[PDB]
Chains A and B, each alone.
Chain A
Amino acid sequence: KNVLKIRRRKMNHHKYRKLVKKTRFLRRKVQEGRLRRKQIKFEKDLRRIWLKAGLKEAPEGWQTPKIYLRG
C-alpha cells in the first residue's frame, strides 16, 4: 500500500517536535506554574477533609508533602 497516511502523520510529528523545540523555555515556565497550582489544589482537597470533619487544624503532626516536585 501507499504511505500517504504515514506521511501526514510524519509531518505532523516533525512540526510538533520542532514547535516544542522552539518554545521549550516557555513551556517549562508554564509547566512549573501548573505544578504549583496542582500542589495548591491538592492541599485544598486535604484541608477540606479535616475542616468538614469538625477539626479546626490539621491532625497533630501532619504536614502535607510536596508530591509533584521533581525531588
Chain B
Amino acid sequence: EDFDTRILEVRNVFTMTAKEGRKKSIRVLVAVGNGKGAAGFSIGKATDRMDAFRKAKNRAVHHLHYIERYEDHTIFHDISLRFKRTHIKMKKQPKGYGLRCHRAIITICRLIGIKDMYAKVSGSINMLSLTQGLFRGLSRQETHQQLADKKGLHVVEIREECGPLPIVVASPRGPLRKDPEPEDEVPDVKLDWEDVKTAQGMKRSVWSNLKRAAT
C-alpha cells in the first residue's frame, strides 16, 4: 500500500507469425516507488493491456532500488552518465527549485522522493534507456558519509545563505587524517560546454527558464 505505480510507456508491438500473420501485443513500462527512496521499474508484456499492467507493476516491486537522497529532497552530487545512446545530466539543487526535468524523470523522481533537481536528457530519448539509465545513475551516487570514510576527512558544507559558517555534514567513522588534501592549483576535470556557456551568459535559448506549473 505504501508504493505508488506510474506508467512510463505503453506500446503496441506487432509480431509477424508463421500462420496467423501480424498479431498485436502490448509492451508496458511502469515504475513503482514509496516516496522514501525505494523505487523500481519493470517491463510488462501481454496480449491485453491490463494484464501487462499487472505483470509490470507486480514485478517492479521485486526489483526495487534504494536511492540515496541528500536531506531527503535532492541528490548528493551532480550526476552525468550515458546509457547506450541516452545521455542524462543531473544537477544537485537547493530546496524550492522543484523538478525541472524530462516529464518521465519527474514521474520517477516523485516515486523516489526527490523534490529538487535539474536534469537534461540528450541523445536518443528512449524511454527504457532513460529509465534504466536514470536508475543506474541514482543508485551509484556517493553520499557524504561515504566520501568522508573514503578520504578520512571532514565534509564541510559552505552555504551562501549561512555566510562563512562551516557546516560539517559528514565525519569519518575511522581515524581522521592529519595531512591536508593536496590542493591542485588547477583541476583536470572535464567540463560541460553547456554549463560553461550558461555560467558566462553566452547560452541564449527561448525555451530555457520558461514559466511552468509546479512540479
Do A and B come into direct contact in the complex, CB within 8 Å? no
A→B interface (CB under 8 Å): none
B→A interface (CB under 8 Å): none
